Amino acid sequence: LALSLTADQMVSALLDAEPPILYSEYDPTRPFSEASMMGLLTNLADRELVHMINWAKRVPGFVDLTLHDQVHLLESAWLEILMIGLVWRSMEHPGKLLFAPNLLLDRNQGKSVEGMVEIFDMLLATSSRFRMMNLQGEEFVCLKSIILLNSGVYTFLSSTLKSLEEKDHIHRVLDKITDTLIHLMAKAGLTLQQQHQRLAQLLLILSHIRHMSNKGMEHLYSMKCKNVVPLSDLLLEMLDAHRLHA
Amino acid sequence: LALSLTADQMVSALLDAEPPILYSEYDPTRPFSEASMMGLLTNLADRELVHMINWAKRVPGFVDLTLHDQVHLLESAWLEILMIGLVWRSMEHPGKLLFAPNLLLDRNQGKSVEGMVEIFDMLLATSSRFRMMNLQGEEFVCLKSIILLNSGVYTFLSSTLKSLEEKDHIHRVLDKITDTLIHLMAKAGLTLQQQHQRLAQLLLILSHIRHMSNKGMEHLYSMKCKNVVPLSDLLLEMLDAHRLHA
Ligand SMILES: CC/C(=C(/c1ccc(OCCNCCCC(=O)N(C)C)cc1)c1ccc2[nH]ncc2c1)c1ccccc1
């Protein structure tokens, strides 16, 4: 079980779970101002979501939950998870966002759609902050799993007994990831005082990732994408897998 | 200076800084369905904001900042600060929100304005979570000061030298409040492992306070309050105080 893993085993499992880095799908032989920036980002997000599902299934503790709860967690967290990935990719690219290895965009390119450049600047400031802190890959995968488990855990509909059991388990997994972060920091030599300070600096950036997700979601809902299968159904379909290909 | 305070001195200073608990201003001899719920909450928020300014000036480190930066921090954080106060007041009132000692409202009373009951439920879930964790008053005042200092620190416009110095100072104050939280938890007997776990559980709730603030702000902007002095000017006026009454 998730709750019996050691720190190194948690880290190994999170590292192995990482999704691939995907490419934007545009014709690189054709001009750039043809392309719709929102169309490129939308297509990229849709492909990435399928992989995110595979990733979340490999995060220790996640497939112990109900499919209803798995859907709820991913529905709450998907844009934060995309965003923390984006910021992490972009750390060593000051002033730009690496949406994909063929789609590295600066501030100005942000202006194409009224909205983004606000978000674009928030994302660059976050990447900058991670660069300052010298965020490690092992710390990053802990933080991204924390988002997955934490973002939706305060908005479950019910206090059924099953729901109380599900919340307790989520909170126990989160405690194991905190232990794992502390173990990483100790292993790299920081003092106890530096350990707690760094833990707090990393978790406080998660508040800013939430903010950015909310600002982006505000824009996405305003696009008004007239009757399509709701996100929970699509999540349910990808999550509600059969086992015929095992 | 803020940076030279001990933990006990930080806690004492935060406890002494606490604003008063204000009452809603309605005629308690007259019927309830006369009153506009949004009008009551709006009036309450406006009075509370003046006191919040006084409070923020007493948070160690805050008046070392530029008035521009003080405005920016409060402009980002004011609704989170109101909300964490609300949740704290409501902990020992299961199923209700204590907006004021004469304005304790349940879920159903939330429904008066299309919007709130969504937010209302998030706020009740947060109060419940604090009740579960058995949040202390000393921990609460640390968390509320963290919101004040953290919420806006990733969205400063500039990297002027003065701005870099201001960010470094904010980050040093935040590190002192983390040390203070850890000292509280140690003083109350928790193990080192429990210390870090509790630190993470408290800071992750701040992500949910951000979310709720954003959902509320979405509603407030949609009200479309046609040309009034912008919030930054009003903040500037209360913050940009003379010293003639010293
Ligand atoms: C930060 C940039 C950004 C991104 C973004 C994300 C999602 C977007 O689309 C929402 C989905 N609508 C389609 C619904 C139909 C459907 O699902 N089907 C038919 C299967 C669009 C953009 C985006 C896209 C890809 C990314 N990789 N990493 C990060 C990242 C981010 C963005 C977000 C909000 C506003 C503006 C821009």
Ligand SMILES: CC/C(=C(/c1ccc(OCCNCCCC(=O)N(C)C)cc1)c1ccc2[nH]ncc2c1)c1ccccc1
């Ligand atoms: C959670 C409930 C909630 C609250 C709320 C907060 C602020 C509100 O008004 C915004 C200000 N507009 C006036 C602008 C003009 C001006 O400033 N001048 C002329 C000086 C309204 C409500 C509220 C009010 C008082 C509170 N105590 N503690 C918490 C708390 C919260 C709420 C927030 C958003 C949507 C729905 C409800």
